[PDB]
Structure formats: C-alpha cells, structure tokens
Subunit: 339 residues, 3 copies
Amino acid sequence: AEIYNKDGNKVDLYGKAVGLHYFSKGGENSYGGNGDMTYARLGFKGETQINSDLTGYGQWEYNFQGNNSEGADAQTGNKTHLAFAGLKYADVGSFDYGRNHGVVYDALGYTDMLPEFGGDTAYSDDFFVGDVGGVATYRNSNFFGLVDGLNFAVQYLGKNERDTARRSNGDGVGGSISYEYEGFGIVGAYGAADRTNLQEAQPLGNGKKAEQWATGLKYDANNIYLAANYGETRNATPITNKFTNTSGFANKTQDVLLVAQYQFDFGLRPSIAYTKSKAKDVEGIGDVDLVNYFEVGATYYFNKNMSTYVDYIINQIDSDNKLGVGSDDTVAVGIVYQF
Amino acid sequence: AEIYNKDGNKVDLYGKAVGLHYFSKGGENSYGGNGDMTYARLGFKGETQINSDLTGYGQWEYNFQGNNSEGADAQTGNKTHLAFAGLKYADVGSFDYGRNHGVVYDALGYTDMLPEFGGDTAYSDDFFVGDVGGVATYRNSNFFGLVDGLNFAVQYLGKNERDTARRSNGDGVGGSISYEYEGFGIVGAYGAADRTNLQEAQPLGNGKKAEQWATGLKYDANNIYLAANYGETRNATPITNKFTNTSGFANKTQDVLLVAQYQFDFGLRPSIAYTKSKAKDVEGIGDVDLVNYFEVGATYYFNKNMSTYVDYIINQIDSDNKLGVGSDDTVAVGIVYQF
Amino acid sequence: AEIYNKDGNKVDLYGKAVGLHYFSKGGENSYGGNGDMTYARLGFKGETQINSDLTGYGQWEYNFQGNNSEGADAQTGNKTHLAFAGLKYADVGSFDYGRNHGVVYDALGYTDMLPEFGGDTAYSDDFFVGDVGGVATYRNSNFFGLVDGLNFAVQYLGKNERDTARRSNGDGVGGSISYEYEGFGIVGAYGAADRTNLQEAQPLGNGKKAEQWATGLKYDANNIYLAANYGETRNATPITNKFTNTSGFANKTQDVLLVAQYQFDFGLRPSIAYTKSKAKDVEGIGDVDLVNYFEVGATYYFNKNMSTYVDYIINQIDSDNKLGVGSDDTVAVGIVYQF
Ligand SMILES: [Mn+2]
Ligand SMILES: [Mn+2]
Ligand SMILES: [Mn+2]
C-alpha cells in the first residue's frame, strides 16, 4: 500500500493479520507446541531518489503477537523484526545499518519457504544466520554492473553485549557471493565473529570465535520452487539441555535443508521438505540431533491479499533425544490477510 | 482513512488519541480510579474481493497507553485488542479466527455504549463475554439470505493455558441468535467451556464447566438509543477478595445493564445508565455485589473526527462490601481525536 | 505523508528509521554509552476543521527501539513519546490534554537541536522540562491576534503517582511567554509543582515544591541557527549517586546550553555546542557537575527524507566526579530515513 509517491519519495505501508493455530499432542514435547499462535505484522518501506545515481532507503517492521491476554503477558513475543536505513549508489553498491538479516541468511533464505515452519537454523540474534541487531551491510548487485546475475555482500557485525549469552555477540565480519542464471541460484556465505565473555562462561560451548557458513542452490521458475542448503557452524548454534537445565552453544553443527514446491495456477501450492541439524562435541553428551523432520504442507492463495495453509511436521526426533528436544509431530493451520 | 482501494483490495487505517482524566477522592477505593488515563489506538481493517461470491478480510487493533512514563512502566496496559482473519461467502456465512469478541458479546454489546464506562461484565480474556484469544467464529447474516434481519453465530473457543487462572480457558462452544426489525434488536447468546486445572485450583470458584449467557433488547432509531441486557454466569466471572488477598471466579453471577441515550442534531448526546452485577456462593462470603451504579454522562460530537465527554459514575457499592469492591464515585473527562 | 484529506479532516502518517551507533572506550563511564542505538518512530498527526473558527486535533508518536534482541529485552526503551488531543479556537487560543511537552520545554527547545545529543536538561517525566504525562496546556498565538509574534502558554500538570520517585510528580502550574522578531526569539518559562510523598522520602533532595524555569534566545535565519538557554531548578533535576547506589533529585541546579550551527545549501550542517549543568546542596556531596561538554558535529541532508550525521561529545566531566557521572567522550554515527 503506497501511501506517498511524490517526485523523489515513495513510502509503502504493509502489514498482515495471521490467524494461526498449532495442534500437537497434550504440547511441551512437540516440534512447534500447541494452541493459538495468532500474530500481526506492521511495517513501512521507503525509498527516496536523491539524485540520478543515489537513492536513500529505510525499512521498519514490527511483530505484534495476537495470542497473549491483555494482562501481564500482553507483550510476550512482540518485537522489532527489521529496522535499518541505507544508501545505494549507481553501480557501486548499497550500504545500510541497523537490525537486519545476517549475511549467511543470504544462503539460508533459499529453503526458508515453508508455509509456517522451516528455516530452523536461521536463528534470531545468532551472529549471521538470521535477524540481528547492529549490522552494517555492503551489497553489490551485478558485480559493479559488469557481470549480470553476480552479487556479493560484505557485512560487519557490531558487538552486542546483552544480558543473556543466547542474545549476545562480539565484533565480526562476514560475506556472501551469489550467482543466478536461467531460473537457478547458487550462493555461498561465511561469517566469523568473536564471542563475548558471557558466552565463553557458558557450560555448553567453548572457543574464542563463532563461525557460520552455508551454501545453497535453488530453482525458481516454471511454477516450481526447489532448494537445498548445507551449513556448518562452530560455537554459534544455541542449544539447551532440558535434563541439566543448562544452556549454551554447540561446539559444532551440520545442517541440511531441502524443499520442493509446486504452484498450481488456480492457487494451491503443495510443499514437501526435509530438515536435519546435528550437533557434536557437546559437554556431557557428545553427538545429538537438534532438528530432524519431514514436512508436508500446502498453501492456497486466493489472491495476493488472502491465503490459507496447513503445515504438517513429521518429527523424526526420538523420545530419548539427549538434549530433551521434543519428538512429537505438530500441524499448523493458518489464515492470512495481508496488504 | 482508506490507504488502498485498487480493484479487489480495500485497506483502511484507523486510530485515535484520547486525552482522558479520572477524578475520584484520594482513588484506590473508587469505581474507576484517579489520575491520567490517556491512551491511543491504531489499527487496520482490510477486505479483498476474491471472486463474485467470496471475500477475504483481516483486522488488527492495538492499544497504546499514554499514561505511562518512559521508564520501567512504559508498556503497562499496552496490548492487542483484535487480530483476526477470515473469509465470507455469498449467502453461506463468514468464518474468521484469531483474537476477537466472544459470542456472548453479541448480546452484551447492546449496553456497552457509555462515553467511558459501562460494559462492566464484558471482561477481557473471560470465555465468551469480551475480547478473547483463539476463537473461531462462524457467522450467518439474514439466515442464508432467507430471513431478513435474522442472524446467528457459532463460535469454538480454543483452549488457552496461560500462567494465570484469570486469563486462561479450556475448549468451549458458544452461539448467538439475533433479530432486528423497525429499529429494534433482540439477541440471545450462550456459551459453555471447560475450565483449566489451574482455574479449578483457585480458592474462589468450583466446577468443571464455565457458562455464560445473556439476552438483550435495544432500540436505535429516531436519535434514541435504549438498551437492556440480562445475563447469568457460572464459574466464569472473575473476582478478587481484597481482604483475603485471594482471587478466582464467582460460582454464579446475575447481571443487569440498562442504558438510555438521546442524540441532539447539534451534537450533544446525554446518557443515563444502570449496571448491577451480583455474585453468589462465594467461598467464605456468600452473596456480594460486584458492580452497582448509576451513570449520568454526555458526549459532545463536534463532527465524526472530534468529540469530548464527561461520564459520572454514582457508585452504589457500600463501604462494607465483602469483596472490598470500591464504593467511591468516579468521573471521567475525555477529549477524543479519531480518524 | 498525508493519508487522508477530505473536506474537514487531514491526517498525516509520519515515521523514521534511524540506524545509529555510539562509539566510546570500553562504555559504562562515557557520556552516551557504546554500541548499537538503532531505533524507529511511527506517529500520526491529525486536524479537523469543525467550523470556520474551531479546529480539532490529535497527535500520537511511539518509539520502537531497534537495538534489542527478540528475547526478554525486546521492549526495552519502547514507549509513547506523545499522545494528546485538543481544540483551537479563532484568536482565543488552543487547549490540549495528554502526554505532551512541559511548558518549560518552550524555552529548552531552543538549544535541543544537536544531531544526536544535546537537550540534556529536558528530562522526560520531570515536571515541566520535557515529555510528561497528564498535562493540560492552554496556548495563545499572537496575543489573541493583537500582538504579532507574542505567544504565551499556561499549563496545569496533573499529579502522576507512579511506582518510582524519578517518574512521579504532584499537581503543578506553569507558564511561558515568547516573543519572535526578524529571525530572533526570546522566551521565558516557569513552573512549580508539589512533590509526592515518595519523592520526599528519597535521600537526595528535600522540599515540598519542585520548581523549574528557563529563558532562552535563538536566531534562526540566513542559514544560521544560534541559541542560548539558561535555567535553574529546585528539587526537580533527577540525580543518581553511583558510589552510594542512591538516587533522588538535586536541591538546586544551574544550567547553561549554547549551540551554533550553519546550514550550507548543498546539505552540510556543522554544529558546535556547549552544555553545563551543575548541582548544589546534595546530601553527602555538596556541589557537583551533572553535565559538562563541548559538541562538534555535522548533519548531511541529502533531501528532506534522508540524512546522515556524526556527533562528537568532548566530555569535560572529570574521572573523580562525586556522583560517578561518566567522563569519557562519545561519538555517534547515524543514518536516517524519514517520511
Ligand atoms: Mn527475518
Ligand atoms: Mn473489545
Ligand atoms: Mn519530546
């Protein structure tokens, strides 16, 4: 919804209301939980033509949970998703700064396409893999305008010394390179950052640097969407041990995500996917699967404003998992109005 | 404020800023309290024409309190009022899901018309009587298009197992039927739900099912608004005992609400009302009035964007009330800008 | 961004996304701190022409911090900046009520012009000097339309009995008078209010009334902005003692703020400023500087939507300060998209 378009400046207001319910047995031992998961999003996205070569931009988006009471829990799960501003010049590149996606998400975004679930390794506030505060990101499209389809990025992660180790990080650098051709896309991305003293002080995890990288392929054409990600992390993936009630990072993980989807012209978009994340070298445990499931699902698009969906997670995690990770299935049912 | 209207999709942004002050003696023993009560609302309401018979819709509304400091109390009273999405077909009905009004509010809305106060039994997060998370609601207008003025609804309340008993509920079903003719409206509505284990574990209240029903009449025509509600609840109305510092639900209540109002063409709308809510079978007490007052008030509408109002509550609750319910009067003064 | 303009009613939606980073040594002993300071603003401002002499209005603005994780700290620093509604008549005056600027801010606003910092004595939730809840404000423009450039205001501060003494206040009255001529402006403003029992009970500070006043001059013309404020407070300025971990108000302060700025036509706006705030009669200390710095800074305006800035605070506070006030420098770097 364009609310302003005079000369230089264009502003869009956008939002959505998501009626959403999760069904699981009982559901504290399930993949996704059980009960109402309704939420809403509001945001703006703006762009100003400063001169013939230079554009300025900003974006903001907030999440308002709709599954809280109006009492003490009213704000649970509310947060800023995105908040950044930047500048883009000609065929030189773009620079933005704020709360934005980590550069490894350039790869992980390939498989973050499921109706409701998926994208399990793109954790928020986790270095370079998901949403993260205080990133400066340089992006180049079409390699200075010389090589069509060839993009790269360089990202500096500023340190965020927060109260919890889960949500903190030290200074870091990361980058990504991407090539797209005839409906395919190839991507690789890598970042390394320091860990904070509060992260080192955690039982689970040990080392001075956190590292994350991932590669991916996608195909996105002729009504088909197929993608695969591979990734490895060092001291970056957050974990909990529900037996020892302790927490930290995984010394190492290996991550695989696959998705295949077809879009029928009358609106139905079935989805199948697989996701497997395994950790290693975990103080008091050894090797343990963090995520392991098959997904079968569908979205029905009535048009670009209205959709409904069912997302079924066949959870392959075992009831004996050493970290306590839930092993039951979850199915989501969603109805979405957006503008 | 329509911010988009192209072909299928219409989106309205709406909001208001309410400068509001409550005057009571001292005011911890008063009906409404004392001090600044300023707040603001923002929302969106959208509608998409999917085909000739089928429309999609969404609505979201948030409350931002304006009577908090910017310190630790900044978010007190902030919350999502509404957040839902749905579909409406032809002369078959509508279905929506999310945070929405309980179906008994179809009746109680009849008397929830006072400038500031009123609607005292339409508690939020209380089964079917007010705002509630995780409801699916089927609505039929004009009985499949066969009987003009005859509407009904069926609502399934999904369970919300929250940290407090006050804000929780179990699975439930409810319905309402309504008939309107020559400026009158007749309504009845009933819902029953299970209570959670955390609700059963509360001192005040006992039983496995919560029930709420209400009937109402209104007249709304020739510049007059007159309405009456009657209702009864079992194990549903929340209560506190300020002597024993305990809390729970009332085993039973009986509720009466009356309102009469006249709208002068130059803008003044005087209001008088009566509200009485009495509980029964309360562990350690017996019978006790929850609400008991006369209201005299007026709104002045300058136009549809700007209004001012005074709302006087003559509180008939006694200083000896057994639950500690406040007995002093309260008067509100409000100035409202909305769009 | 005007989202509605039909006949009587005009509504603007406004907002901004501020990518912002503070650099200080380490930075718990610095002026501004260290790390990401990204935030966003959203608001609306509306105005209705009720008749030829009478206009109605409302404004709301919220601050959403973008430097929080999505965990427990998600809402830190979020708040309502402004929330009020009012009426303006002909050449009689305006009246509004809500969360608005204290009338002493009529003076202090003169020097609150720095790219990022500055305006250090316009504390929020501090009687009349900054943002404050529950104020009713009468304003007269051009002295009933008789004396061009001559404005005054009268403000009644309603009592806000909050959980902390820092954020509370008692009933109070304040006023301001202002004269503008040939690019100059002269202002004086005074307010006095009662303190609450919780404020009296604080170690630092003693007395039954809080008082704040300030005068100022500005020049704002020919691309130059020059301003000076002087102010004195009694029992109003909040203070902390980081040695004794105690808090309260200063028995007295004296405040000086100066700013000079030049706006080049191609967009660069350099700024220099000085700010000094000194307290007196502080239980267990005597005299101590609260603020003391030089500022050198610049904004580059690409256009009215996009800007960038650097703001350098040369902090003159000493490492031995008796209240523990930080003594290190801070520099901010900001990139701003607004509409
Ligand atoms: Mn994201
Ligand atoms: Mn409601
Ligand atoms: Mn302000």
